[model samples]
Target chain A: ENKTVVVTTILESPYVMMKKNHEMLEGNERYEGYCVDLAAEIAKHCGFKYKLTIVGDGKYGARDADTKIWNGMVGELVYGKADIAIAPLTITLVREEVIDFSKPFMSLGISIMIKKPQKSKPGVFSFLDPLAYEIWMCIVFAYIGVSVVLFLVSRFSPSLSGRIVGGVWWFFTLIIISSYTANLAAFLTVERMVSPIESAEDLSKQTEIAYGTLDSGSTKEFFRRSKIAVFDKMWTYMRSAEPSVFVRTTAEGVARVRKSKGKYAYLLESTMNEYIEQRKPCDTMKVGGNLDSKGYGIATPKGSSLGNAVNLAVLKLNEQGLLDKLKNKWWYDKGECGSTSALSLSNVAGVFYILVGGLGLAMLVALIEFCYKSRAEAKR
Target chain B: AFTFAAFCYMLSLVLCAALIFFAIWHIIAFDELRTDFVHARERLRNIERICFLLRKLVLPEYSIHSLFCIMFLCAQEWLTLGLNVPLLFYHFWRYFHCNADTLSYCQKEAWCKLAFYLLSFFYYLYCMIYTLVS
Candidate 1:
């Protein structure tokens, strides 16, 4: 029962692509990417040789409403155009009803992507950001209250009451001040970029910013079919809004974001959004968190014979972390933008130096103070 | 991470055990050298001064009762060596009232009252350093 199986996948970047010397290379060697490597490992594990076949329409399978016909990788699997499909195609209820999905190898969610804004000019009062305004008020009033208490008590009885008030208050200020300075330097070192939209709700609640997703992909479908009040309201606005927000492809969506100035946001899979954010120009960031959770799976036609074997292979790869290794290999190791770093020594240097010249010695001095007092009293 | 936290906690207990012996010896020596009244009187002063910052003001003569009173009366401790005088008071209370002030009685029971306070109190001081480092 030897046969050359057909595997349908998309021409998505970092997932599947033509090798530089593809014209010279033959068969599976013509393609190289995360899915390409995964397909090879899968076929090897499942004991079959599969030829890489790009989906003819270049879409991840979605069904046409008028024809009731599935298209893209889903179309190939259903119509027997290909025996299997391996891509970043999301596993969902609509797709699951028409085709079989393996255990998800990669989990992701719908996320928002936006053009990077300008650098923030640090504020004069930003140094106080380590704690809140209310805390600073409390501290000021507390210090006033304590000093007044100590002043009032010392007049009445300086022996014990005044000393206790001063001792406790002094230690309180030292620790509170130390903690404040400890966190303050780091806030100054790496300034935060304040995004106007921090969540999907922020995107929906405002009209100034236009946000959309790929025309036929899972992300758009997520909005169209979502039942949550915020998501439903956003989809309603997107459905018939003036100058169309729908994008034909993810690249088109990302380009729309760049071209739209700071007026637009794109909703897409976090995996691709993160991958794009790490690319050249680095003028994009995956904002907030994903809207809804889902996973990418290898797809097969309903009740296909290969489904059982492929599911196990996917699970085995997941458990062994081959899935994780592939994601890092394609997304990060090849990343052009290197991320920034540490809390830094200078950030905490003065605070620590003061602790050294001050707090540290207080321990030694306190011990010595108690010792001397004990010695003096006993000598009598 | 758990191991690092566990090992640091382990060392503090070791330090805790070691401090107990020191507290016992310090108490015993103080007891042997002073009159019963002076020794008892100074212990009250030392307990009050246990806020530690009392000495920071450089006024070594003041006697004050410690943390619960410090926090209840003054509104603070700043999480120092031991936001711990309430427990120290447990022993201080007993040492003051207990009739165990004789030389041998001090060795066996009276001095160790403060010594036991140092055990838990020193454990707390050791643990407090982690808030700064991490």
Candidate 2:
């Protein structure tokens, strides 16, 4: 008989949800959710008997910088109280140094959660959105560089080379500018949604729309201790807010956001944010891409024999699409909002194919130009 | 200047085209050529080189110039400290050590020199911190 492995997990929604009749059930049957199903699949694959135990402390895990002591599920794993931790615990660098985390089962990032954006009329300058600011600056620089080069070189040589350079650069600028303008016009044709903050920069730039994350949680800690200026400023604002902007939990944050009616925003992980977005009363939406990318992984104590086995099991589950299927089963299958598939390659592969073909043609043209230039130099 | 511009243009186009081809070929034809451990080893070597650079700077030597030059020439193998550090040191030494006529050719404002020294001090401090942390 296999030794019974004690698995520590947290009661995170969808990850590990308690059943209404959990009081009647015993042992593993007491819980029912994604983690519950995942634990079963992992145990079956690894051929190990496991006892599912919820961490006494509900915290995911963070180390006390001063005490050097770990808290939450990571602490349990570190102290050898639990054989493995299979939960929504994020794989962080600090934790990785103390304990071993398996390859990530699910990848997610810190994303901006905002209330439904208000429809706004497009401004005259709306044509600037497609091309980034740096790109526009580069176009100006390229124009100057080409004009200066042509002027200087033509003064030295009595040839049409200057005309050619100027013409080519103008053509390039024309195409780039036209392409950007076209894309921007098309983008602007769609109804514009005016979000209070488009990104973390916008959040830091203005304090009109207050935002905060779960108090004493990783999201709060991320802002408080962040070295980045934008996050640092945001943290300062949140820390010194009049009535204490911090919320006790993500649920509380979401509730406060709804009650505030677009005045408050909740900063949360993309996974949790997306899950909530798909749930009933989809007033909240993920505004921007994640600031930083990380993932949730199964943690085992350093050099645990079962570590490799668990990692391999995770990888196997991922390869077989079982993990994805499980996510759908838990998060999306009963989603209140209509499930819309994100854009895929098959849907818009023509642009990419055309891009490759264009590059190939350019390469051929470059080869011919190089050969022609070398021949002309030889004749001179 | 015109010839220089032409050469730069040729170099840029060739380099750009070659880099593009190399990237696509690596992805489609030779994906196995990408190895994580090789990069890991290189990262460790870089840290080792940084430590060595700081140690060498603490004790000045004429031989350090030769060592640095050789390392730079054989950059493919012993790629260590960036060229910027050695170049700065060489120029600074040349400015001080070179004999000058009584024509005030080496004349420079006091504040400009102080500003440069401050910049150098901060750069050294940065390197020292990096070395200690690594």
Candidate 3:
């Protein structure tokens, strides 16, 4: 009998929405979303027949990136409960530090969805907005210009000793690079980490953010790490200090925020951006900017035969433009589906391969040179 | 052996034809292939592995690729050749020319494989380019 490969996926909307007549599908009876299409592409490339099984709880496999218990379908794959976990699992350094992700099929600069308001925060822009790139560029160039001016001023200063001036310039340059790098890194990390944790609205409003209970869930961990306490959580403690505080389920928390009833916020990766954007009232991801960044790779149990096949499948989808086609089919273009570029993700793999192979070729050349030199010495 | 060679030659012809047929199938039923992984994998494996064979038909993996290119080559051979091919020859090639055992042991070799695959990949492209250009 052929090996039965069971594919585990999550039923997040627009990603894995079943057909109205899906119950009628005999074997693989579900209609797909962008992710579903990509998963199908991957499976096809790997020459594996699969059954799409929903993850137990849709929390991208639970591991307490805190109190580590492997939960979710990712956990299942980790523990050998399933063969594969294919959903819009965001690639994060923290996540990659543990489980493998197939090269990301898409990228969404973390965005915050706020209720359209009477007033905009000064200089606040959706991190998802590409305009942020211009903003960052301007910031970078402005700093460079300022540094040049500072250096010129120091160069001609009458009172300041040349050595002191040089030392000061170096110090300033070091500070500028370090601080700028730190700020950009912080902005990006915050944007990525603050998923489901959208805008100033979330912090100010009567809504509670939904987050996964599974350990080290970056979103949940964000709250724990943040010095700012949720108003409700604060109030709950003030009222009675009971252990029975207002802790809502991750979904319920987001729901409360969407309804504008509970001050709930959530954090997650852009992986689920498509699904959240489609909700009627629309749950906004409030991360201020990308909090973090990472790449996902197709994983195996340490050493498995499937890695090469899966990796190749990833490259093939990327080359064929199937990934982009899948995105368009999901109506991610409508602005609600929170689509990111598939090219950046593909390029990540491309760069990785290019660097690796170039290094290998260099090594081979060196080895050949060594052998040729040894042979010449022997002949002498 | 001549019959097998002729059969392989004919099979290669058939496989090439099949690859063309599937390539057309892929283009025409692009959405279908994208949607169905099994059909896609079948077609691609047929194309990729068969193409590997057409090359292997002239030069076996041991002789053709190099010391490091074996596992992927062998995998494709199995994928294309099926159980009908001699496992011993493949295994013998695996031990002698290629360091299949130690190659994968290096954690960093994933990077090496990535590079190696890309270089060979370009080499394939170059072959196709030369085939067309010349």
Candidate 4:
């Protein structure tokens, strides 16, 4: 018997969308998308007959690890309902903890579509930034500075009884810093991702930044995890927000943003960058930057023998430029000119620049201080 | 007034959770807790008195358990800072060799037991805020 593999997928436009006649799509020539095309290629290579089923509950393979009730396409595989999941599922560290992922079939980052930049924030920070390493650095620098200042002040001052006073005072400061940093870190990274849309408060106040997202699909998985509840509310507000309205499709989202004259912003994948730009009244992905690098991959059941074969197929597709090609074919055709290295390298440079400049400035200040101290010592 | 009310509520919550844990332990040890309501209350009071005396004595084991729970709470708060590294490592090891006797069931059960802690932690947060508003 030929093993019929069920490929669990969701309808995220230009990636996976059903024909208006989707019931008729199965076993017919109609079902199509970049994933559909990629799925066909993978099935051809792996020699498996397949069907594309939309994952229910709008989750993308998130499992509680405790309850073990897997949801979304990953759930399908976990529960033995499907043999494979080859859609636009991105590999996350938490997801990787549960399922084995193929070499990414496509590379994408979680991007926030906002009003095109009139000005970029310094410190290379963005509202969309979701880097763990950066947040940890914030905690480290803040703590180190406070600790050292307390220790130094305790060294010289007596009437202040800096040792006794600074010890208790610094302890309180540390407690304050610890609580605030943890809360801020939670809000910035996890809270924002789980609930990809800003709060109702923000939406109401910020009329210039109306929001919309792809429908209840795998693409919204990023938002789903951060705060599923808020994402739903944001979805409604995006539609009702003044000057612009919430939209379901990326094309509509982009169109609304462009048409609104800075009143609307559309969230989309970097994969769809070119295609949206080519369309009429096109807006831009804010140099504003992306939320997280969510790598794309073919997912399989935990103990599948064909995992290696699928991964190899994806690596071949990448080498053939088919991965990037498929991305462009649907979204952008004009071609992204720069190499991927520029973005990554510039990010590294930006981080190092801040560190180096901060150190150099601190040393210069220390040198000036030492000169003043030497003058005072000579007078003594 | 809100601050004072909130503090009082949080203290009650922590104290309530501790008392409930002790009360359950007493019932489990004696058995038939449901039928004998008066006896159960009397037994629970006796156990509570003993625990209070033990706490005051600052016995090493009691102090150790208290410190462990405090550490658990602190680790949870600093979880993003990787203070909860034990939870990650425990899961990772279990993922590979879950059934091996060399790992021991007790070690494995430590990982299993965290479910209630996670549940209570979430419920505690919800209750604290709910209790405040109400």
Q: What share of the true interface contacts does each candidate keep?
A: 0.00, 0.00, 0.00, 0.00
Model 2: per-residue lDDT, tens digit, B6-88?
22233223323433333343233212222211977876676566445434332222322333334333323222335335544
How well is each residue in A1-380 modelled by candidate 1, as lDDT tens digits?
Answer: 54788888889888988889999998689988999989889888888888888877878877688998888988888888988888988777889998889998888888888988754344444456798764664565466546544643564344777678778888988999998887876665555443488898897888889988777755666677788999999989999678989878788988878887788988888988899988978889987887787888988889888899999999999999998998887888878887434444544455556567877789999999999999989995
What is the C-alpha lDDT profile of model 3 across B34-97, one tens digit per residue?
Answer: 3333876787775565445334333222322232223224323333343223433554655677
The residue pairs that clash in candidate 1, if any, are B48-B64
Across A279-340, the per-residue lDDT of candidate 3 in tens digits comes to 44454543465444544445544444676677778878878888777766565553443423
- Sorted on lDDT, highest at the top, how do the candidates line up? 1, 2, 4, 3
Better of 1 and 2 by TM-score: 1
Interface RMSD of 3: 29.3
TM-score of model 1 vs. true structure: 0.50
Each candidate structure's TM-score, on Cα atoms with residue i matched to residue i, is 0.50, 0.49, 0.38, 0.38
Residue B4, model 2, lDDT: 23
Q: Model 1, A337: alpha-carbon shift in Å?
A: 1.8
The DockQ figures for the candidates are 0.01, 0.01, 0.00, 0.01
Task: RMSD for all candidates, in order, please.
Answer: 21.3, 31.9, 38.0, 32.8
List candidate 1 segments past 4 Å from native: A118-195, A215-217, A239-243, A340-380, B1-134
- Scored by CA lDDT, what does every candidate get? 0.71, 0.68, 0.50, 0.58
TM-score of the second chain, each candidate in turn, equals: 0.33, 0.24, 0.25, 0.29
What TM-score should be assigned to candidate 2? 0.49
The best candidate in terms of lDDT: 1
Reference-based lDDT, residue A260, model 4 = 62
Looking at candidate 2, what is the lDDT of residue B68?
32
Q: What TM-score does chain B of candidate 3 reach? A: 0.25
